[PDB]
Design an enzyme around this catalytic site. Structure first.
Site, mmCIF file in Angstrom:
data_model
loop_
_atom_site.group_PDB
_atom_site.id
_atom_site.type_symbol
_atom_site.label_atom_id
_atom_site.label_comp_id
_atom_site.label_asym_id
_atom_site.label_seq_id
_atom_site.Cartn_x
_atom_site.Cartn_y
_atom_site.Cartn_z
ATOM 1 N N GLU A 144 0.748 -1.249 0.000
ATOM 2 C CA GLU A 144 0.000 0.000 0.000
ATOM 3 C C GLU A 144 0.780 1.303 0.000
ATOM 4 O OE1 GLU A 144 -3.145 0.208 -0.408
ATOM 5 O OE2 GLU A 144 -3.912 -1.781 0.304
ATOM 6 N N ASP A 160 -6.764 6.942 -5.296
ATOM 7 C CA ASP A 160 -6.253 5.639 -5.666
ATOM 8 C C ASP A 160 -6.387 5.371 -7.168
ATOM 9 O OD1 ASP A 160 -8.944 4.211 -5.836
ATOM 10 O OD2 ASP A 160 -8.771 3.953 -3.622
#
Ligand SMILES: [Cl-]
Length: 162
Positions: free
Chosen positions: A11, A20
């Protein structure tokens, strides 16, 4: 190597709001803010979560707190899931990590809906569950990551992350 190390890698770390791959407001170590397209809205939720007026940015430590909670929540969601638990309870330690990584990423519910791959994992039929997980929106939306995860489940080792 453990779940923490694993996901930090999968991540990354951002101190600033960011969007994202799905285009959602996010922060820290994959800590989902909101699915809404209002940076404001995202600012508020961030504030609510940090407990202070952030103006879009946090610190490492802040990031880390969200993260520990995020991993904790994932664990508990597993333990509390009727579909997830036994699976989890039946895997060795590397593989539970992998299960945890996916839950972190998609939610109990999401993960709970892979009912065919779940049985297979149950049977300890690595190779095939693997083929199965690959036929997922998940695998095509973010193949490299998905591959690590799936390799980890397959092998039950951490090679993908070394
Ligand atoms: Cl929060």
């Amino acid at each position: 190597m453990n779940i923490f190390e694993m996901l930090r890698i999968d991540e990354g770390l951002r101190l600033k709001i960011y969007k994202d791959t799905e285009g959602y407001y996010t922060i820290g170590i994959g800590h989902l803010l909101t699915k809404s397209p209002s940076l404001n809205a995202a600012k508020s939720e961030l504030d609510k979560a940090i407990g202070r007026n952030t103006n879009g940015v946090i610190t490492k430590d802040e990031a880390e707190k969200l993260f520990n909670q995020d991993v904790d929540a994932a664990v508990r969601g597993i333990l509390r899931n009727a579909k997830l638990k036994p699976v989890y309870d039946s895997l060795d330690a590397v593989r539970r990590a992998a299960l945890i990584n996916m839950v972190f990423q998609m939610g109990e519910t999401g993960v709970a809906g892979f009912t065919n791959s779940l049985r297979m994992l149950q049977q300890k039929r690595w190779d095939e569950f693997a083929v199965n997980l690959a036929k997922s929106r998940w695998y095509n939306q973010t193949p490299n990551r998905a591959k690590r995860v799936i390799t980890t489940f397959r092998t039950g080792t951490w090679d993908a992350y070394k």
